[PDB]
């Protein structure tokens, strides 16, 4: 069988935003 | 006078224990002198060598997984963080005189031990020695093969080198953690957590040196006692009947012959353990979860499972938000193989319909159905053994990188069928060759 | 059967026959090897056996000599004593195995050239007992059961079975009750409460907004300080191995930091393979439904752990953009979200979202959207 | 010896008697426990046995229940669950022990109240075996040696004995040679070359003028377990254990620093007792030859290792000035250079010369002038 | 039912091994009933219990002398440097259900 | 550990002539060493119980 949670996508990907970092301690 | 001393000691023994009647029966026991009857002797004699060498290794081995920094004489691994299991294995090979010789003799004895069991099993299977009343001895022996199967695997993983550790992750951990419903419960149970953990090697060390050998020794004792009192079978021939044993007595022929054969097995094992290098663990370094080597050298006493892993297609099931990975097939496959091997005489007597007392060995050509099946089983085992050296086989024909496994997939049903037909036809031809 | 008077005058030859007759052994043929003592062939054969036995002692004495007086210490490759050390173990096995092999050879030759050849037939009394032991042993066991009156006392019999069963069930459970651990007991502190070990890895955030760096290994992982990297560190078609490293993990200078770094390398789901594909190949790239915006430019981050059995797939073909697992030879097409194309693997390698921070260092944009490593029953 | 037809017509009692006669066992007394049927005592005894078996079953079920549901995890001191945790293991033994004990009690009662009482006599037939067996077994062994022609072939017999002896000696040496180690191989770097382990300790200078501080154990693992000490830190009548510490050893923050401090802590000849004699008792001090200047005023340093068997003799009585070893009750007079005055100790404890540096920290003024610890054959 | 199965199994055992004369000899052997004769069984039974509890202990014990830092649940020893042998011995008595009972039974045995 | 240090080490090393060679062969050097516990573990779980079982 094929894994249900594994399928290809055709929607283009966007550039991820820069990481800021929230310090908890 | 030595005769005076011997008579006095024999007089003292008889007056206290009176063993004369029991000893004379033991000395007059008759054993057949066929060459194929020494197959079980080699396996028994190899186990003794494993016991003696295993005791020596226990005096210098630390089974801890605790991380330590190497400080031995091996320059390439100086300052490398490793476990106590790997360092002491290095300590045996380098900083202990004769440790490398004993370590390699022990490994070579295991290979001869495993090889002799399969060869001796073939003699029992082909000659029909598993029939009544020797059906229970087949079951006892079949358990010995399974116990010796895991015993070698656990010992090979004791040094905790890069190659041995990778096998634990894939075989011992990867297959177990994917068994339906209880697979992760069996993994948290044996490993005491997640891979690698901190009780893996110590638990295997106790199992490998003490528990499994204790069960094997008990089963071997019951195995040898059964043969001694069931009066080992013989091949048909001149003067050979179903109610007699034709051969030589224990004294002084069989005792000297068996004792001298013990020396040759020890002599052969000593030669290979010194001249032939086996399992060089210093070339690979300690096991690291992030590092896996490409060029390896797995044992032939536990590779057929690896070959089945590669050849089997990536068939998986996902029933109702779950997962049944490809490793379940291999784990299930070992269950049927072990179950069929153990209960062969019961199935054999059910289809052939004969449940009579048998003492004369059956000719392999007489039964072409069983012979061909045994040849088919031996052939199927060999391809599965040779299906995991695909890395070197691939760079021989260069027709395709992935077609090597397709040879195995298609050729695990055609070649066994071909071997079955050739063996079956050969048995009939040999039957009527002298008839 | 014979009285003491007969046994006094019996010779050894007849005594052996008498003893064998009682045991059922009939030696039908016994012949000495040499019918005419004094021939040269017998003397020659005796010398051959002595030579094999003497060679065992000569080799056995050599084993004692080579074990004591021979350079045994390990010598490094390219040294004066390296050649002599390489012959230490072979001489240990050559002088030991050949010593006892020759002794065994000299004993086999002795038994088949000097011990008289014999063929004895022993009658085997297989099958059932001769109906006299069967009846007596059956009566002995039946009398014990019937005499004890245990069959007709049901209150004792049922209590004995329940009492033994209850004790056995409790003892067996208590014997293996300490080797049973719940695999899903929340023990790993994560950003959202505590989760099980399998659901987490080194990339799982411990608090919201936590920064995890794609750190390289200066030397051996876990033994050398981890160093951050930037996108301008991997060439086109290159491959790099990264580990989840936090700023608070240190660089291994202190004891506490060294333990933290060791745990990072000890992680079974920690390694991640970072690959950069050439700009002339982005057109033939297929995304995954859920990981469309996980890559940063032409940089992709897939877990190094194979999805089949957990082997970290180290091999990578830059020409074909294929990831090869060295254990069972599985190829993953890095262009098509690292999906498997051949071998026993059936699930695609998990993809780690990546991005950059304010300083330009490569960081993980979050956690894996699926469990990493080999599959199990309670997965997905 | 009955026939097949006779055995089929025999009752169970006769078959048991016949089997016993064949085995040489005669049951001279055999009677049922309850010849009179339908008695209230028999039913009462039947319930008594069942009651004990029922108790065993109830306790076995209780063992199953307490092992699964009783709180078994350790609880800290002063916690609410400490009392219940302290009864976890006691409940395991009470339920398990009572279960099998009750079953054993019921089994004994059943044998003594329901299994018939019997007296059986068995003939020993011990001593010398019958002459028929003695002659036959002796002939069988004799015929093997007299027929193997081994006795009259002396070159073969000598070769076999020498070969087996040489091989046995060779394999024995190779089996045990690895364990053998030379005690006096110089492996310890000192100020005047490599020395054997037993001649050195942590106080042996590794170079001339090396400063070794008398460091005190702070009791905390890591983060400076050893710190410097001053003469004013110890009062009169006080005793403190000191260890050999160097500047290069570090504070244990670094991994290499921890290993160096671990070696100091586990050094078997390292610990030293520093005592401060009361100034009013300084006139009673008797000096040992060669050790008159080993004390810095009223501060004395003696090895903590007892000279008898190596136990730490640290029971320092301030008033009697006696050092007592807790292992075998050895007593040393601290005023008279730790001379033994009671127990199996015959040699005085070694004295460490001490002084202070420019900063006022107590340091060693050299090495021990005698070996430290238990004596051996090669000592003095 | 239960009587036929015993007879069938008894004949099956006797047909393959013929242990009838030998077993009857072991069943008929006479032992004196004196109380002091049972003193050798106490040592034998203690050894068997030692084997059973000893096998259980080997599944959790790491006999290493390598020094480590304690990270178990026993607070009064948290952080104290110790060998792996002492590490797992505390783990048996604190982290394994029934380990304290088994370890105590072994040493009493 | 105190019992080992006295009984197994000091008495063994105090034996005349070969007393220190026996201590080195059993501890692998000086007390406490690094191989005593694993060796004692092997002797206690396999060898001595194995000899006892055979003798029993
Ligand atoms: C008879 C056999 C034939 C087959 C048919 C019968 C069985 C079919 C019937 C069912 C059955 O199979 O039961 C047996 C099993 O039972 C127990 O499994 C159950 C359940 O099935 C599992 O799937 C489940 O996974 C277990 O929860 C654990 O994960 C949970 C989370 O997971 C979910 O999420 C996963 C992944 O995603 C998330 O991943 C991470 C999770 O945090 C995070 O990263 C993140 O949150 C992420 O989420 C994202 O989500 C969205 C994205 O879109 C967004 O929101 C966000 O972006 C977010 O990021 C998926 O992958 C998973 O699939 C799942 O969906 C946690 O929540 C939990 O805390 C825990 O960790 C759960 O365990 P529980 O609840 O602890 O216990 C309950 C109870 C079992 O009930 C029963 O019915 C038992 C009776 C029937 C079975 C037979 C036994 C009885 C028969 C007799 C005894 C025989 C005489 O326990 C028990 O008594 C088990 C005792 C042992 C068995 C004895 C057998 C007898 C022994 C002798 C043989 C475990 O014990 C298993 O080992 C065991 O096999
Ligand atoms: C038959 C039995 C009946 C009894 C009678 C027969 C035996 C009576 C006959 C003799 C005998 O007993 O032999 C057997 C023994 O032999 C070997 O012992 C010998 C010797 O005896 C030891 O005393 C000696 O200590 C060993 O040197 C080691 O320390 C030396 C230093 O020490 C001296 O200083 C010590 C303390 O002071 C110094 O302390 C530190 C030292 O640096 C520093 O802090 C500092 O320098 C300080 O000095 C200060 O000095 C001044 C102050 O005023 C100033 O200058 C400064 O201020 C400065 O500070 C004292 O405490 C000591 O006493 C000593 O004086 C180092 O120099 C070395 O380097 C090394 O480390 C030495 O060993 P070697 O030389 O290595 O080998 C040689 C050879 C043995 O010769 C033989 O005759 C063997 C044959 C006879 C024996 C029987 C065997 C044969 C029979 C057959 C085999 C049977 C079939 O070896 C071997 O073949 C031994 C093989 C094993 C035995 C097999 C038996 C058979 C096995 C089966 C049973 C060792 O193996 C022992 O284990 C073994 O027992
Ligand atoms: C350097 C270093 C540290 C290395 C590692 C250490 C190490 C591992 C060392 C190895 C040391 C070893 C193993 C030493 C061996 C030395 C040795 C065997 C020397 C013998 C030389 C010699 C003088 C030979 C002849 C003299 C002699 C009479 C002695 C031999 C004594 C023996 C072994 C007699 C066995 C008698 C006997 C009844 C056994 C048969 C096998 C058994 C147990 C029964 C099972 C069995 C049955 C039941 C059958 O029915 C049967 C039917 C047909 C064929 C076979 C069998 C069969 O084997
Ligand atoms: C006709 C008639 C009624 C007549 C009367 C009968 C009569 C008179 C008597 C005469 C005899 C007859 C005919 C009567 C019938 C007899 C009868 C009932 C037959 C049955 C007897 C029999 C077959 C023997 C019993 C033997 C026995 C004790 C049972 C053993 C049970 C079995 C089958 C064990 C095998 C299971 C097993 C060991 C599998 C484990 C594998 C798994 C799942 C582990 C996973 C796994 C792991 C964890 C790894 O470590 C690993 C490492 C490396 C690679 C892979 C793996 C891997 O897959
Ligand atoms: C009324 C409920 C029970 C029914 C009564 C009958 C009992 C049946 C026998 C089971 C007895 C074992 C009881 C163990 C105690 C218990 O209740 O465990 C609970 C575990 O969850 C459960 O209820 C699951 C129930 C049992 C499932 C067993 C799993 C399946 C099999 C396959 C496991 C393999 C074992 C080997 C045999 C297979 C061979 C195959 C050929 C809590 O787990 P946890 O607390 O997380 O772990 C702790 C550690 O931390 C701590 O060190 C210490 O080890 C313990 O405290 C441990 O519990
Ligand atoms: C631990 C591995 C084993 C050892 C050490 C062992 C040892 C022996 C030995 C020494 C014999 C004496 C006769 C002979 O060697 O031919 C024997 C006989 C026998 N073995 Fe094995 N064996 C082993 C495994 C097996 C296996 C795997 C089987 C079958 C599955 C088996 C079944 C038998 C049978 C049936 C006999 C006697 C059969 C006959 O009387 O002809 N054994 N075994
Ligand atoms: C009975 C069958 C046995 C088999 C098939 C077996 C096989 C093996 C193998 C293959 C290894 C790895 C060897 C290597 O390091 O290269 C090993 C290691 C080891 N074996 Fe055995 N062995 C057996 C019995 C025993 C026994 C009874 C002991 C008891 C002491 C023992 C002690 C050890 C030890 C201590 C090691 C690890 C040290 C080392 O690797 O050098 N073995 N065994
Ligand atoms: C592992 C420890 C021991 C066990 C398990 C053991 C077991 C037994 C048992 C069960 C018996 C038969 C019952 C009895 O008479 O008490 C027995 C008899 C005997 N034991 Fe022990 N025993 C051990 C130690 C010893 C010791 C220390 C001695 C003497 C030093 C000894 C000498 C004997 C003797 C001479 C008999 C003869 C029995 C008799 O004639 O009554 N055993 N042993
Ligand atoms: C794990 C189970 C292993 C096998 C255990 C078998 C236990 C059941 C034994 C049944 C015996 C049948 C007795 C009988 O009356 O049937 C008899 C079977 O024939 C025999 O004489 C069998 C002799 C061999 C028996 C050896 C058994 C040893 C067991 C010792 C138990 C302490 C029938 O004889 P009958 O017609 O009644 O005169
Ligand atoms: C004599 C001896 C022994 O002999 C070794 C020989 F071979 F050299 F002779 C081996 C083992 N133990 C002993 C004695 S017991 C003992 N327990 C103690 C506990 C604390 C302190 C001291 C102790 N002393
Ligand atoms: C047994 C041979 C046939 C096996 C068929 C298995 C098919 C599983 C398909 C998935 O996908
Ligand atoms: S482990 Fe990756 S292919 Fe099997
Ligand atoms: S150890 Fe100090 S008195 Fe024996």
């Amino acid at each position: 069988c094929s894994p249900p949670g594994e399928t290809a996508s055709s929607e283009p990907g966007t550039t991820p935003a820069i990481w800021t970092g929230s310090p908890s301690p | 006078d030595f005769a005076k001393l011997a008579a006095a000691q024999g007089d003292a023994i008889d007056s206290r224990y009176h063993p004369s009647a029991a000893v004379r029966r033991q000395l007059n026991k008759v054993f057949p002198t066929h060459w194929s009857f020494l197959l079980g002797e080699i396996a028994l004699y190899s186990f003794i060598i494993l016991l003696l060498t295993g005791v020596w290794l226990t005096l210098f081995f630390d089974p801890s997984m605790a991380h330590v920094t190497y400080d031995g004489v091996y320059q390439p691994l100086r300052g490398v963080q490793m476990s106590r299991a790997y360092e002491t294995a290095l300590d045996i090979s380098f900083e202990v005189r004769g440790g490398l010789f004993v370590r390699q003799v022990h490994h070579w004895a295991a290979l001869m031990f495993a090889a002799s069991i399969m060869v001796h099993l073939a003699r029992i299977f082909f000659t029909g020695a598993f029939r009544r009343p020797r059906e229970a001895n087949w079951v006892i022996g079949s358990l010995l093969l399974i116990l010796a199967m895991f015993e070698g695997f656990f010992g090979y993983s004791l040094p905790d080198d890069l190659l041995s550790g990778t096998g634990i992750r894939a075989a011992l951990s990867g297959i177990t953690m994917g068994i339906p419903v209880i697979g992760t419960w069996m993994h948290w149970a044996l490993f005491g957590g997640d891979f690698p953990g901190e009780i893996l090697i110590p638990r295997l060390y106790a199992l490998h040196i003490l528990l499994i050998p204790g069960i094997i020794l008990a089963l071997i004792g019951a195995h040898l006692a059964l043969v001694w009192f069931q009066k080992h079978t013989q091949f048909p021939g001149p003067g050979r009947t179903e109610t007699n044993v034709v051969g030589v007595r224990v004294m002084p022929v069989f005792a000297v012959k068996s004792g001298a054969f013990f020396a040759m097995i020890t002599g052969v094992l000593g030669l290979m353990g010194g001249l032939l290098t086996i399992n060089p663990i210093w070339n690979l370094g300690p096991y690291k979860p992030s590092q896996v080597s490409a060029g390896s050298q797995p044992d032939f006493y536990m590779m057929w499972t690896d070959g089945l892993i590669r050849l089997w297609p990536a068939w998986e099931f996902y029933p109702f938000g779950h997962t049944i990975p490809q490793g379940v097939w291999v784990a299930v496959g070992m269950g049927l193989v072990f179950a069929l091997l153990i209960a062969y005489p019961f199935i054999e007597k059910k289809v052939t319909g004969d449940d009579a007392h048998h003492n004369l060995l059956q000719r392999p050509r007489d039964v072409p159905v069983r012979t061909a099946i045994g040849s088919m089983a031996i052939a199927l085992y060999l391809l599965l053994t040779f299906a995991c050296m695909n890395d070197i086989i691939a760079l021989k024909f260069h027709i395709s990188l992935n077609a090597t496994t397709w040879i195995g997939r298609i050729g695990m049903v055609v070649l066994p069928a071909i071997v079955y037909f050739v063996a079956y036809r050969w048995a009939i031809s040999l039957q009527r060759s002298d008839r | 059967q014979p009285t003491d008077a007969e046994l006094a005058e019996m010779s050894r030859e007849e005594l052996v026959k008498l003893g064998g007759k009682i045991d059922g052994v009939e030696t039908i043929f016994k012949e000495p090897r040499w019918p005419v003592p004094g021939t040269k062939a017998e003397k020659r054969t005796e010398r051959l056996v002595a030579y094999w036995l003497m060679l065992g002692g000569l080799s056995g004495l050599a084993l004692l000599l080579v074990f004591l007086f021979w350079p045994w210490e390990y010598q490094p490759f390219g040294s004066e004593g390296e050649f002599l050390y390489s012959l230490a173990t072979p001489l240990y096995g050559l002088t030991f195995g050949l010593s006892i092999l020759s002794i065994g050879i000299g004993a086999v030759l002795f038994q088949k050239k000097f011990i008289p050849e014999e063929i004895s037939v022993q009658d085997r009394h297989d099958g059932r007992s001769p109906e006299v032991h069967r009846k007596t042993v059956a009566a002995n066991l039946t009398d014990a059961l019937e005499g004890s009156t245990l069959k007709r006392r049901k209150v004792i019999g049922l209590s004995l079975g329940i009492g033994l069963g209850a004790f056995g069930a409790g003892t067996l459970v208590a014997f293996i009750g300490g080797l049973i651990k719940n695999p899903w007991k929340p023990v790993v502190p994560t950003a959202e409460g505590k989760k099980a070990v399998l659901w987490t890895s080194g990339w799982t955030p411990r608090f919201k907004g936590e920064t995890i760096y794609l750190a390289r290994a200066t030397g051996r992982p876990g033994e050398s300080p981890f160093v951050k990297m930037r996108p301008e560190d991997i060439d086109a078609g290159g491959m790099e191995t990264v580990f989840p490293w936090r700023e608070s993990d240190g660089d291994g200078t202190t004891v506490e930091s060294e333990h933290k770094l060791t745990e990072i390398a000890m992680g079974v789901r920690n390694p991640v393979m970072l690959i950069r594909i050439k700009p002339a190949d982005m057109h033939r790239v297929i995304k995954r439904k859920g990981q469309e915006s996980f890559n940063f430019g032409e940089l992709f981050a897939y877990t190094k752990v194979c999805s089949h059995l957990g082997c970290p797939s180290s091999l990578y073909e830059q020409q074909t953009y294929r990831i090869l697992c060295p254990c069972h030879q599985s190829q993953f097409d890095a262009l098509e979200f690292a999906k498997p194309i051949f071998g026993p693997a059936a699930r695609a390698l998990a993809q780690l979202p990546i991005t950059i921070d304010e300083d330009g260092y490569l960081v993980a944009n979050g956690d894996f959207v699926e469990p990493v490593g080999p599959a199990f029953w309670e997965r997905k």
Side-chain angles (χ1 to χ4, degrees), chain B residues 170 309 326, chain C residues 305-313 325-332 343-345:
Chain B
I309 288 170
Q326 190 257 10
Chain C
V305 191
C306 189
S307 62
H308 177 222
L309 278 193
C311 288
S313 58
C325 193
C327 292
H328 307 125
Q329 315 295 328
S330 299
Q331 293 82 17
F332 302 88

Side-chain angles (χ1 to χ4, degrees), chain A residues 1-2, chain B residues 312 314-318 329:
Chain A
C1 291
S2 158
Chain B
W312 203 247
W315 290 332
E316 294 195 6
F317 303 90
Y318 315 96
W329 294 86

Side-chain angles (χ1 to χ4, degrees), chain B residues 6 37 44 152 157-158 395:
Chain B
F37 293 163
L44 159 74
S157 310
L158 283 197
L395 278 75

Side-chain angles (χ1 to χ4, degrees), chain C residues 46-321:
Chain C
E46 187 198 0
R47 263 198 299 278
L48 175 80
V49 170
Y51 289 164
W52 274 114
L53 291 176
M54 206 45 90
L55 188 153
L58 183 63
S59 173
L61 188 153
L63 166 64
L64 190 140
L65 287 194
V66 301
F67 197 80
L68 298 176
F69 319 105
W70 184 266
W72 79 273
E73 279 106 348
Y74 160 79
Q75 295 297 109
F77 176 26
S79 46
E80 304 157 336
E82 199 256 330
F83 179 60
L84 284 188
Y85 156 69
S86 57
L87 292 181
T89 301
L91 285 174
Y92 291 160
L94 183 66
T95 54
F96 165 82
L98 184 139
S99 177
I100 189 63
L101 178 53
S102 53
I103 284 180
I105 285 170
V108 164
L109 284 187
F110 183 83
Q111 83 97 22
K112 70 174 52 180
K113 300 292 192 218
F114 297 116
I115 294 189
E117 190 215 329
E118 85 182 1
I119 170 168
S120 43
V121 185
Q122 191 188 16
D123 189 358
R124 55 172 84 192
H125 302 286
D126 289 345
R128 292 167 177 80
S129 296
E131 204 60 33
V132 56
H133 311 306
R134 292 175 50 103
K135 296 295 288 184
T136 47
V137 74
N140 197 296
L141 285 171
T142 310
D143 194 292
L145 177 65
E146 288 288 331
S148 84
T149 73
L150 179 63
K151 288 167 71 174
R152 76 162 204 253
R153 302 184 195 283
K154 308 225 170 163
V155 62
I156 300 169
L158 277 296
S159 290
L160 186 57
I162 296 169
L164 271 182
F167 164 75
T171 296
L172 188 153
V173 160
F175 201 76
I176 68 171
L179 271 168
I180 302 303
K181 303 173 82 86
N182 186 24
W184 309 114
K185 173 220 260 195
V187 285
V188 179
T190 70
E192 59 273 15
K194 293 172 73 176
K195 301 175 157 343
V197 171
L198 275 192
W199 304 128
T200 70
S201 56
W203 306 94
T204 299
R206 314 205 174 112
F207 53 90
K208 179 181 178 293
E210 188 180 14
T211 296
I212 312 155
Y213 295 102
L214 315 176
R216 210 194 73 240
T218 300
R220 298 176 292 271
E223 319 174 9
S224 65
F226 285 122
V227 65
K228 300 179 276 192
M229 65 183 73
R230 316 180 52 105
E232 59 273 15
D233 291 331
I234 297 89
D235 63 358
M239 183 278 288
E240 203 60 51
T241 313
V242 302
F243 296 85
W245 179 72
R246 281 137 184 96
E247 182 88 343
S248 66
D249 273 313
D251 58 315
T253 50
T254 76
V255 167
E256 157 196 333
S257 166
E258 190 276 331
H259 294 355
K260 256 157 174 181
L261 294 193
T262 296
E263 184 209 43
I264 290 173
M266 281 300 93
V268 76
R269 297 173 290 279
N270 281 5
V272 164
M273 185 144 47
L274 194 76
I275 56 156
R276 170 201 282 279
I277 62 170
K278 308 184 156 120
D281 284 322
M282 284 282 288
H283 58 280
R284 65 182 180 179
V285 168
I286 306 106
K287 298 295 181 72
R288 180 141 165 215
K289 189 169 294 179
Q291 324 172 334
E292 293 96 354
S293 58
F294 272 21
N295 66 286
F296 184 75
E298 61 207 56
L299 269 165
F300 291 79
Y302 303 106
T303 187
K304 199 174 181 182
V305 191
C306 189
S307 62
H308 177 222
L309 278 193
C311 288
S313 58
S314 301
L315 289 163
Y316 165 78
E317 274 82 7
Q318 65 182 357
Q319 183 62 255
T320 61
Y321 292 165

Side-chain angles (χ1 to χ4, degrees), chain B residues 10-11 14-21 23-24 27-28 52-53 55-56 59-60 69 95-98 102 249 251-252 266:
Chain B
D11 192 83
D14 193 51
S15 44
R16 292 183 176 87
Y17 319 107
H18 51 84
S20 285
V23 163
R24 192 196 67 248
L27 298 197
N28 283 325
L52 293 180
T53 54
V55 163
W56 193 97
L59 303 180
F60 310 91
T69 298
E95 293 83 3
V96 180
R97 202 195 290 231
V102 175
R249 289 165 315 150
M251 294 299 291
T266 302

